[PDB]
């Protein structure tokens, strides 16, 4: 489903070129940082976990910015 | 092309007038070329090499 | 993927270490173009 098509993934964002959200922050902090994935992995490689997260609706630019602000304080 | 004399024409594409410009060429097996051609002014002109 | 001396090594090390992050620089072809144009006698430079 999500591995084949990302139409539902981009419907939440509304801009196809706004994949910087999916890659530059979410996938990177999963790969390098200690951040834990939200949805179950299902043995999927990263960058497909993030796309699934945006497809369901946990990850968006405002949410990631808010979380970043949360770890800004101490 | 065999050595000898050959008469050719530019088919009118040389100038915007469209007049055919006939010319002759003497091609040797060994030596220098030699051409007689016209101009839209209707004058002979010899070209060497 | 080519023409940058430091980017190739840095990205190779990053891929080996599992980090898929690149730090691009300026290609050497632009440098050689600039050097040969400067050799030709026309001053060309990068201003900041």
């Amino acid at each position: 489903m999500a591995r084949v098509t990302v139409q539902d993934a981009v419907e939440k964002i509304g801009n196809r070129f706004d994949l910087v959200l999916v890659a530059a922050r979410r996938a990177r902090q999963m790969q390098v940082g200690g951040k834990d994935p939200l949805v179950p992995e299902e043995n999927d490689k990263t960058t497909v976990i993030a796309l699934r997260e945006i497809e369901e609706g946990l990850i968006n630019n405002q949410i990631l910015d808010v979380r970043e602000r949360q770890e800004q304080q101490e | 092309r065999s050595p000898g004399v050959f008469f050719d024409s530019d088919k009118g594409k040389t100038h915007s007038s469209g007049k055919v410009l006939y010319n002759a060429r003497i091609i040797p097996y060994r030596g220098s070329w030699l051409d007689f051609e016209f101009d839209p002014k209707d004058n002979l002109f010899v070209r060497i090499d | 993927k080519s023409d940058d001396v430091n980017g190739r090594t840095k990205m190779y090390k990053n891929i080996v270490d599992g980090n898929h992050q690149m730090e691009p620089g300026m290609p050497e072809s632009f440098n050689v173009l600039l050097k040969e144009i400067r050799s030709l006698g026309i001053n060309i430079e990068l201003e900041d």
């Binding site: 070129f17 910087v20 790969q31 | - | 080519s2 080996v16 300026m26 040969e36 006698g41 026309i42």
Partner: protein, 1269 residues
């Protein structure tokens, strides 16, 4: 760490400052030892040490000693890479002129000084440069500029160049070189060789010669040689400096060992092999491979199969890293060795690695955007890449040994970029038009329509079934045939309910195969999409409907299911081609005999002196084209209809099951031309230049050709192959010019807010609507007054995008024409806004921000030309000539209408057309315009205007071979300006019934006869001049060249009686290769060379026509605004492209047209700083005017310019793009003279320097950088 590129002239002090080493005296290179000789072109003190962290002298060789100079040689220790950076200089005894400034352009030195180029040329070559340097130093710029202003074209050029020097700060004396720089050593390598000798580059020997001549001048002047001899080798030094940089411009280019000209510094920049177009706009990348492609029809639409041997090499670093992670290896070398040994752990790791990384596949010619796509890879055992069958039509990829190349994305963002924008599941629709690209073809259609086609009295006909499952069971069991006509209870879902699906079940009369086919369609589509024989068009329309109604994922699933079912049932079909399948009719020889009789009569006519040669040629070619069309029709009828089967003991006819007819009717592969050449006449062949009418090839490919016919046929094959191999270059050049002219504009804003736009109206060509109004405005936002044909009531509001339902609403009320806003009439700066462009055709909704429109438009216009050029030899070289229509018959009944007509009534009373651009429009009774026709000069209309005409009636009759001249007024004819042997020729035929005068051509006319212009003037019976109704001047007709007159002087002629006939040029074989030069001329804005006269000032109205003829685009622009020229260019280009059948949307041509016109000439300066009439960029003028209006001052007034794509691309704000396009020397020297600045705004400006392009995913980064400033 930079934001701009600054280019200017180099002062001698700057060059002296560049050098790290002292001087360049000794001319030597190497070979004193293996160490390089002191002070040579490869040295140590000057250009740095040769060995890393080790000096040449050998005192110290440790990085702990880095930063110390040497003692034996004085060479500082540094990493050897610095040899790629350092420079040096040569001091010339005598100053030498730079050839770039003196030549290769309107001479800069020749415009600083008034005297022409020849004087300076003779001065430099001593037939001296010091004199030119002294003269350049002598002038003062401000005084001469003030003088030149005092006298006040050439003076404007001189003053602008002087002001360029004044502003830029480049002193003229810097033009003459005093010190010459040298390249770094590693930039011109001394490449090692297997043998003892070392290969030497061209630059080293040129530098060596220059040093030799300079050092000769150094010692000779020191010895006080006589003035006669000192001057001679100064010319040689000038020639050597000429050879070193930009060799070959002064003539007699220096040749080395062999007879090949040497390669100079300026040859490393310009040309195909220069750094711009070989190492900056295209590179050789790592992590890539190449291999042949096979079919592998077991894949899904998002998958590609690649070999294990390729993958194990492509993904080596990932394998190394994960082997280190698993703990199997402790270092890189151990994991490497494990990789060469190819153990099982390596294969398991590789299977884990390639799980979700997509890979990019591209073919060799990347004509358009779909030529590169991202696929999910699956490992296969073999050596060839497996590619999905549906994708091939996008790539233009067959399996005749064709190859492909694969790259692997490396980083995270690259993987997401490939997954979201590159993956093949996203590319469903082409960016050039709304039609989809993944269309089943060949075997898939072959199976599909065979499933859906019906037969009479099959096995199991007349049966009632529960549903599709019972149909499949009956077919697989063998109790019923696949073509049986049955009744099935089928259930269908519809989405007519608001946001919901509702079901309805009914008994429908169908066939078994259609019942099985019904089982794969997705929920929510009507049955009637599969209750018919599915050709290629039907399947494509079904896929388009599925995309429109349901979405994208159901469309992908449906495409995969369609491919699988088509393959399976095509295989089970067992359809084969046989020699008994091709059938020949019996009318063929009859119609060939009658055509032979006709052409023999034409030859007899030409034997008499009544007709000329070209007219006979045209007549014969038309006769044979008509005969070929007739034989094709008769044979296709015989193939189609002739199948008779009996039902319950009575005969009946049906559509044939013949293999060839099925193959042709399918549209899978083949056309009517191939079938007609297999079973009719092969036709008329076309030479590489034109057509040939030698003989009719009255032999099929079933019954073999003889020797003469095959020899004739070889001409078309030669023509096709030559056309392909020698017009692909022209097509590529046009595509490159379009790309380089329209590379810059991107979407930048959402809504500019303007109101105006162009008016879209339906277009028809003689009774068949090629483009209806629906697709003319499909996806374009409305501009103004789109209200329905009901007064004061609006059907649709303003500034809304037209969907499919909106278009259906327009069609239901039958709107005639609609005004829509376009790209050209946009007010945004440095780009276009989203709304004016409209819907992007690839995605299906409004265009987002940051999509590069220009590249898409250029590729869309460029692909069809080269593709159709390459596909020329498929048809076999047959002439694509359609017989010209002698008359016009209206298809449907309606009122007659004549537009822009000037006509006269002859004795017969028929309306004789006397205007060049008369048009006939067919209008129905209600008032809608139905059909449009073009009426050539001299046509006669049987029925007068204003009388209703029934269908099938004849409207006009004319001869297309000759264009007559018609008499306006009745009177006696008098010959004028006719002299035999000077302007006309007279002959009397022996016995032909006619004696005629042929007007001599202007080319053949003698010098004396040019002043006299031949003409025919009508006179009164008494000898006076005839009076035209309401005209001051009498009637006279100017007979042009190649005119024929049978009339004699003093003969009374009736009104509307032809006098002279002008035979028309043949111009046969209308083809894509025959039409592309028209497109190139249109986009280059070339002069028609016979322009039509347009009234500049109304008082006659503005834009009217005075004398008929071709209309130049410049006149149309400057008299009617940008909208009219946009309409003209778009209509002409679409007219050229429509004959071949390729579909290109208008917005791309509109984008190109807007891209051409960017410059303006200012007529009144106003309060701005621009002076008089200058060519300046339009946007800068717009901001200047807006600022002046803001500050309460007077704005400027200006007029457009129109420039060809080459000139427009060569004249832009940025100089890097212009240099990288072509004519590098001119652009580079002009930029150096003017001291220009580059802001790196476009695409190539960032691509060359290696940054994120300001489009797509780099738009956000560019916007952040801009907002920071």
């Amino acid at each position: 760490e930079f934001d701009a590129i600054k280019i200017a002239l180099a002062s001698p002090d700057m060059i002296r400052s560049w050098s790290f080493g002292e001087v360049k005296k000794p001319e030597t290179i190497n070979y004193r030892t293996f160490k390089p000789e002191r002070d040579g072109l490869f040295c140590a003190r000057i250009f740095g040490p040769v060995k890393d962290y080790e000096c040449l002298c050998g005192k110290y060789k440790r990085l702990k000693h880095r930063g110390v100079i040497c003692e034996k040689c004085g060479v500082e220790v540094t990493q050897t890479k610095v040899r790629r950076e350092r420079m040096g200089h040569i001091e010339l005894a005598s100053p030498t002129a730079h050839i770039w400034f003196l030549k290769s352009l309107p001479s800069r030195i020749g415009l600083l000084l008034d005297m022409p180029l020849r004087d300076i040329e003779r001065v430099l070559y001593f037939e001296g440069a010091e004199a030119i340097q002294a003269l350049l130093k002598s002038m003062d710029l401000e005084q001469e500029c003030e003088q030149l202003r005092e006298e006040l074209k050439k003076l404007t050029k001189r003053i602008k160049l002087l002001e360029a020097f004044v502003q830029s700060g480049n002193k003229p004396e810097w033009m003459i070189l005093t010190v010459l720089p040298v390249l770094p050593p590693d930039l011109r390598p001394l490449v090692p060789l297997d043998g003892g000798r070392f290969a030497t580059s061209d630059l080293n020997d040129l530098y060596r010669r220059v040093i030799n001549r300079n050092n000769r001048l150094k010692r000779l002047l020191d010895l006080a040689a006589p003035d006669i001899i000192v001057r001679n080798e100064k010319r040689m030094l000038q020639e050597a400096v000429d050879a070193l940089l930009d060799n070959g411009r002064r003539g007699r280019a220096i040749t080395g060992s062999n007879k090949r000209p040497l390669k100079s510094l300026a040859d490393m920049i310009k040309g195909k092999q220069g750094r711009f177009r070989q190492n900056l706009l295209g590179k050789r990348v790592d992590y890539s491979g190449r291999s042949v492609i096979t079919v592998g029809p077991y894949l899904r639409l998002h998958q590609c199969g690649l070999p294990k041997k390729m993958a194990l090499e492509l993904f080596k670093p990932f394998i190394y890293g994960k082997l280190e992670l698993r703990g199997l290896a402790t270092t890189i070398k151990a994991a490497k060795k494990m990789v060469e040994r190819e153990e099982a752990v390596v294969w398991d790791i590789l299977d884990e690695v390639i799980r979700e990384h997509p890979v990019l596949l591209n073919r060799a010619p990347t004509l358009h955007r779909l030529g590169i796509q991202a696929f999910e890879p699956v490992l296969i055992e073999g050596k060839a890449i497996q590619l999905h069958p549906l994708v091939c039509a996008a790539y233009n990829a067959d399996f005749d040994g064709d190859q492909m190349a694969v790259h692997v994305p490396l980083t995270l963002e690259a993987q997401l970029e490939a997954r979201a924008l590159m993956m093949s599941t996203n590319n469903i629709l082409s960016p050039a038009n709304g039609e989809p690209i993944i269309v089943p073809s060949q075997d898939v259609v072959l199976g599909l329509y065979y499933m859906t086609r019906d037969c009479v009295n099959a096995k199991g006909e007349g049966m009632v079934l529960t549903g599709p499952k019972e149909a499949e069971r009956l077919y697989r069991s063998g109790l019923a045939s696949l073509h049986a006509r049955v009744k099935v209870r089928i259930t269908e879902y519809e989405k007519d309910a608001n946001g919901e699906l509702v079901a309805k079940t009914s008994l429908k009369d169908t066939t078994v195969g259609r019942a099985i086919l019904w089982m794969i369609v997705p929920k929510g589509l009507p049955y009637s999409i599969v209750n018919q024989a599915l050709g290629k068009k039907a399947i494509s329309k079904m896929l388009n409907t599925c995309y429109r109604i349901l979405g994208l994922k159901p469309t992908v699933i449906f495409a995969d299911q369609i491919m699988y079912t088509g393959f399976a049932y095509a295989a089970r079909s067992g359809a084969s081609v046989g020699i008994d399948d091709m059938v020949i009719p019996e009318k063929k020889h009859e119609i060939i005999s009658e055509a032979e009789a006709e052409v023999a009569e034409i030859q007899e006519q030409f034997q008499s002196g009544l007709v000329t040669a070209g007219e006979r040629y045209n007549k014969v070619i038309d006769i044979w084209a008509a005969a070929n069309d007739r034989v094709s029709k008769a044979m296709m009828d015989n193939l189609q209809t002739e199948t008779v089967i009996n039902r319950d003991g009575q005969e009946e006819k049906q559509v044939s099951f013949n293999s060839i007819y099925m193959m042709a009717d399918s549209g899978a592969r083949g056309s009517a031309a191939q079938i007609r050449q297999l079973a009719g006449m092969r036709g008329l062949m076309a030479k590489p230049d034109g057509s040939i009418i030698e003989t009719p090839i009255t032999a099929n490919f079933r019954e073999g050709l003889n020797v003469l016919q095959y020899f004739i046929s070889t001409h078309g094959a030669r023509k096709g192959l030559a056309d392909t191999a020698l017009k692909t270059a022209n097509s590529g050049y046009l595509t490159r010019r379009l790309v380089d002219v329209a590379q810059d504009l991107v979407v930048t804003e959402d809504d500019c807010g303007t109101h105006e736009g162009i008016m879209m109206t339906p277009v028809i060509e003689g009774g068949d609507v090629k483009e209806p109004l629906r697709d003319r405005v499909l996806g374009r936002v409305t501009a103004e007054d789109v209200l329905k044909p009901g007064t004061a009531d609006i059907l649709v509001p303003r500034n809304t995008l037209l969907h499919e339902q909106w278009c259906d609403l327009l069609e239901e009320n039958s709107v005639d024409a609609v005004k829509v806003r376009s790209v050209v009439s946009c007010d945004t700066d440095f780009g276009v806004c989203a709304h004016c462009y409209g819907r992007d055709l690839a995605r299906g909704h409004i265009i987002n921000k940051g999509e590069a429109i220009g590249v898409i438009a250029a590729q869309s216009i460029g692909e069809p030309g080269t593709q159709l050029t390459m596909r020329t030899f498929h048809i076999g070289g047959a002439a694509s000539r359609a017989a010209a229509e002698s008359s016009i018959q209206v298809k449907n009944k309606g009122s007659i209408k004549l537009s822009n007509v000037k006509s006269v009534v002859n004795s017969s009373g028929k309306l004789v057309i006397t205007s060049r651009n008369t048009e006939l429009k067919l209008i129905d009774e209600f008032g809608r315009t139905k059909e449009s026709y073009k009426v050539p000069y001299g046509a006669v209309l049987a029925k007068g205007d204003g009388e209703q005409v029934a269908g099938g009636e004849t409207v006009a009759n004319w001869d297309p071979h000759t264009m007559p001249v018609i008499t306006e007024v009745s009177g006696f004819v008098r010959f004028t300006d006719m002299i035999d042997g000077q302007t006309i020729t007279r002959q009397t035929d022996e016995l032909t019934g006619l004696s005629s005068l042929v007007v001599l051509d202007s080319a053949e006319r003698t010098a004396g006869g040019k002043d006299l212009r031949p003409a025919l003037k009508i006179v009164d019976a008494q000898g006076n001049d005839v009076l035209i109704p309401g005209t001051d001047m009498p009637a006279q007709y100017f007979l042009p060249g190649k005119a024929i007159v049978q009339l004699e002087d003093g003969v009374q002629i009736s009104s509307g009686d032809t006098l002279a006939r002008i035979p028309q040029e043949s111009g046969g074989t209308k083809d894509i290769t025959g039409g592309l030069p028209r497109v190139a001329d249109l986009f280059e804005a070339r002069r028609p060379k016979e322009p039509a006269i347009l009234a500049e000032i109304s008082g006659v109205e503005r834009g009217d026509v005075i004398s008929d003829g071709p209309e130049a685009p410049h006149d149309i622009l400057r008299l009617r605004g940008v909208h009219a020229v946009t309409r003209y260019i778009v209509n002409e280009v679409q007219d050229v492209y429509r004959l071949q059948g390729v579909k290109i949307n208008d917005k791309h041509i509109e984008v190109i047209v807007r891209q051409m016109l960017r410059k303006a000439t200012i007529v009144n300066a106003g309060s701005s700083d621009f002076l008089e009439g200058e060519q300046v960029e339009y946007s800068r003028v717009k901001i200047a005017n807006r600022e002046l209006e803001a500050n309460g001052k007077v704005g400027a007034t200006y007029s457009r310019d129109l420039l060809g794509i080459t000139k427009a691309s060569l004249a832009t704000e940025s100089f890097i793009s212009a240099a990288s396009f072509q004519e590098t020397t001119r652009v580079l020297t002009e930029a150096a003279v003017a001291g220009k600045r580059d802001e790196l705004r476009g695409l190539k400006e960032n691509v060359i320097v290696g940054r994120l392009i300001p489009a797509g995913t780099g738009y956000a980064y560019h916007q952040d950088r801009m907002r920071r400033r």
